[PDB]
């Protein structure tokens, strides 16, 4: 904050909601709990200038969990190829797929 009155007075007005790795009701975890915690622990105390560079792996994995962009691209690649092979009479799906 601009004025960190929360840290000074010890009150906790809104930090509880800031991250998804914080204590949740009945300990329900967020989907990307592990990825957040790793990134938060990697970058703790070293500052954004360093963290932008020395925690790219943790952040890049965390971003993948959040938006799943690499995964969906992989699935679209697999799905698209099956269409090509199914349509060419080349591959046939097994009963369970």
């Amino acid at each position: 904050p601009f004025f960190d009155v929360q840290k000074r007075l010890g009150v906790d007005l809104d930090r509880w909601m800031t991250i998804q790795s914080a204590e949740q009701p009945h300990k329900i975890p967020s989907r990307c709990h592990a990825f957040e915690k790793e990134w938060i622990e990697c970058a703790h105390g070293i500052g954004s200038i360093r963290a932008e560079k020395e925690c790219k792996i943790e952040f890049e994995d965390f971003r993948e969990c959040l938006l799943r962009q690499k995964t969906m691209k992989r699935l679209h690649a697999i799905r698209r190829q099956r269409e090509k092979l199914i349509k060419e009479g080349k591959y046939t799906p097994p009963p369970h797929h």
Binding site: W16, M17, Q20, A22, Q24, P25, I28, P29, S30, R31, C32, L66, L67, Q69, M72
Partner: protein, 97 residues
Amino acid sequence: MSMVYMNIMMAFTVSLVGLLMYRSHLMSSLLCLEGMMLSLFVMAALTILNSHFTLASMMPIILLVFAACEAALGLSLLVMVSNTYGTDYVQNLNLLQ
């Protein structure tokens, strides 16, 4: 990103252009403002629900509470504009040129 985001983001943009391109009725523009909150509410809810961040499930509710205040504030001004000129037309609000 997921395909739902495409239409929700498009919805926000449509209402944003809706608000910025005025016609005559000031009431019409106040609807484009409630339109922007509706899309912001929906898009926030999808992100929060999908990621299983429990504590922010209250965030969209708080968003609506301060949208109601803005709409009530906007309608109050429309009452006084109408009481002065006999319409809600925005071209009447040009004394300060």
